[PDB]
Amino acid sequence: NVIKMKSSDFLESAELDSKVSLAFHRTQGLMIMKTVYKGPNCIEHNEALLEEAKMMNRLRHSRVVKLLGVIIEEGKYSLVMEYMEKGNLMHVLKAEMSTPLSVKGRIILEIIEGMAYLHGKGVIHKDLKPENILVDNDFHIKIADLGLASFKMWSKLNNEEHNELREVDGTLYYMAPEHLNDVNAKPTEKSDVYSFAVVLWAIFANKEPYENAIAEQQLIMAIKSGNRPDVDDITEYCPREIISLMKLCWEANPEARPTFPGIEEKFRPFYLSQLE
Amino acid sequence: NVIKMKSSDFLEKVSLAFHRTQGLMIMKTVYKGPNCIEHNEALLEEAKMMNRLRHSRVVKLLGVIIEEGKYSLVMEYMEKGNLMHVLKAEMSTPLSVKGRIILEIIEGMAYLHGKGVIHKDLKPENILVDNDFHIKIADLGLASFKMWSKLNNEEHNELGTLYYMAPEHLNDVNAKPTEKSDVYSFAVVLWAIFANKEPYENAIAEQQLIMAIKSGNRPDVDDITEYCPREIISLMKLCWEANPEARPTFPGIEEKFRPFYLSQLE
Ligand SMILES: CC(C)(C(=O)N1C[C@@H]2C[C@H]1c1ccccc1O2)C(F)F
Ligand SMILES: CC(C)(C(=O)N1C[C@@H]2C[C@H]1c1ccccc1O2)C(F)F
Ligand SMILES: [Cl-]
C-alpha cells in the first residue's frame, strides 16, 4: 500500500542541482521529494494518480529506488522517494576522488540486476541514463524514473496550463537510434539495452558522450546513421570484454543486441573472476 | 522454450556431465529403463515451466533429455556442493560470508515468490554453493514438479526431511502451502548456518519430536557456540512463529536484513 503523507510532516525543502529537493520528514529523517504540480485546485485525476502511485509502489528491489510516499493535497501533488547521498551516477564519475575499477564493475552489475528486475515485471524504462542511476554513500546504486516515462498520468500532470512548476517544452545521448526523430515508435526491452551501452561507455570515460557535436540535428542524424560514443576517448583502463559488451549493446538493429539476463550470465562471472 | 538435449551431446543417477561444446554441468537422470510413452508431453510442459525461472540465486535448468527409456534434467554445476557440507568443513566460514549467504537466500526466495512459486522444501540440502561461496536455491526433490518426481518412483526404473517443515504441515498433509511455509524453513536454515549442524540431535523419536514442534518447541539457541548476532536470533524467532500470519514475508525480511548486512556485516 501507498503511504499518504502531508506537507506539514516536512520541515524544509532545499531545491538541489540537476522540482526535486531534499526534504526532512519530522519522524523518519532525510528524503527526496519530486513536487510534480503546484497550482490552483483541480481534483480531476486523483483516482488514477493514486492507482499509478500504487503501481510504482509494487516495484520493490534492492537496485530500484523505492517510492516512500505521496502528498496528494489541494493544488499540490508530490512523489516522495528515498535519499541517495552521492547523487546521480554522472555526478559521482566527475568527482575529485577517482572511482576504482572494482566499484565500476559492481555499479554495472547492479545496473544489470535492476534492469532485469524491471524487465521481469514487464516494465520498459524508456529513459535509462546516468541521471536516473542514483548512488548511496557505500557506492551501491538504485535505478530511478525521474522523467516519469513509465507513469503517464503523473507525467501529463507536469505538462499542464494551471501548473506554476511547469516543464517548458541529456536524454538524446542515451536514446536508441530507432527512437530519434520517431515519437510514434513503441520502446522495447532492446531500447533500454542501447541506453545501457552508452551508460557503459560513460562509466569508463568519466563524462557524457559526443562533446564535439555542435547542433542537435547533426547528432540525431549522425547516431541514426551509425555514429556512437568515441571508444578511443576512453583514457583509463577499460577491459576488452566491457568494450565488446558496449559495442554489442549499441548495435543498430535491436535484435542483434542481447537481453539483460543474457548480459548478466556473461557479465557476473567476468565481474567475479576479473574485477572483484 | 526449454533446450532439448541428447545423450550424445555429453560424456559422463546424479553425476558430472561434460557437454561437448559448453563444458561442465550436473545431470540428474530421473528414470532409466523401458519406454514410457504417454506423459512425455506433460514432462516437456513441466520442463518448460521450470525453464521460466531465471535468477542468479536459483539453479537454472540448462536442458532436458527426453529420449527412448531415459529422462534427465540438466542443471548448472555448483563446485562446493550443498550448504550443510560447506558448514561442516575444517576451514570455518566467517560471519561476513554467512551474512552474504543469508542475503542471497533472501534474494532467491523473493524471486521465486515473485513468480508465484512456493518452494515447499527449503533446507540446507537444497542450497548449493559455488567456489566463491555464492549460493543458489535448488529443488532437488522435485517438490514443485509432480510428473518428474512421480517418474522417479516407478516400478520399471532400474536406478532430516522434517526438520525444516512448518508446524501447519506436520501431521496435516492436506493443508495448502503458502509463502509463510518457506519463511519457517528459512528460520531453521538460519539456525543451521550458525550451528554448523542439523537441529534436534538429542530427540529420540519422530512422533515425540513432531508433536513437540507442533506445540511450540524449536531448535536450541544455546547450541549456537559461535557468534550469531542478536538481531539474526530475533529474525529466526520471528520467522519460526507458530502462527503463519505472524511471520514476515521475504520482501519484509530483505527490507530489514539488507541494511543490517551492509552496515554491520559486510
Ligand atoms: C518514484 C519514482 C518514479 C521511481 O524512481 N520509481 C517508481 C517505480 C520504482 C522506481 C522506478 C524506476 C525505474 C522504472 C520504473 C520505476 O517505477 C521516482 F523517480 F520519482
Ligand atoms: C532443475 C532443478 C529442479 C531446479 O533447481 N530448479 C528448476 C526451477 C528453477 C530451480 C528451482 C528451485 C526452487 C524451486 C523451483 C525451481 O524450479 C534442479 F534441482 F534439478
Ligand atoms: Cl532492499
From Swiss-Prot, chain A:
Name used for this protein in its record: Receptor-interacting serine/threonine-protein kinase 1
Residues found modified as Phosphoserine: S13, S18, S150, S155
Keyword Transferase attached: yes
GO cellular component term, pick one: cytosol
Domain comment in the entry: The RIP homotypic interaction motif (RHIM) mediates interaction with the RHIM motif of RIPK1. Both motifs form a hetero-amyloid serpentine fold, stabilized by hydrophobic packing and featuring an unusual Cys-Ser ladder of alternating Ser (from RIPK1) and Cys (from RIPK3).
Function according to Swiss-Prot or TrEMBL: Serine-threonine kinase which is a key regulator of TNF-mediated apoptosis, necroptosis and inflammatory pathways. Exhibits kinase activity-dependent functions that regulate cell death and kinase-independent scaffold functions regulating inflammatory signaling and cell survival. Has kinase-independent scaffold functions: upon binding of TNF to TNFR1, RIPK1 is recruited to the TNF-R1 signaling complex (TNF-RSC also known as complex I) where it acts as a scaffold protein promoting cell survival, in part, by activating the canonical NF-kappa-B pathway.
Assembly behavior: Homodimer. Interacts (via RIP homotypic interaction motif) with RIPK3 (via RIP homotypic interaction motif); this interaction induces RIPK1 phosphorylation and formation of a RIPK1-RIPK3 necroptosis-inducing complex. Upon TNF-induced necrosis, the RIPK1-RIPK3 dimer further interacts with PGAM5 and MLKL; the formation of this complex leads to PGAM5 phosphorylation and increase in PGAM5 phosphatase activity. Interacts (via the death domain) with TNFRSF6 (via the death domain) and TRADD (via the death domain). Is recruited by TRADD to TNFRSF1A in a TNF-dependent process.
Cellular localization per UniProt: Cytoplasm; Cell membrane
Assigned keywords, A-Z: Apoptosis, ATP-binding, Cell membrane, Cytoplasm, Disease variant, Glycoprotein, Host-virus interaction, Inflammatory response, Isopeptide bond, Kinase, Membrane, Necrosis, Nucleotide-binding, Phosphoprotein, Serine/threonine-protein kinase, Transferase, Ubl conjugation
Boundaries of every Protein kinase domain copy: 10-271
Source species: Homo sapiens
Binding site for ATP: K34
The family this protein is said to belong to: Belongs to the protein kinase superfamily. TKL Ser/Thr protein kinase family.
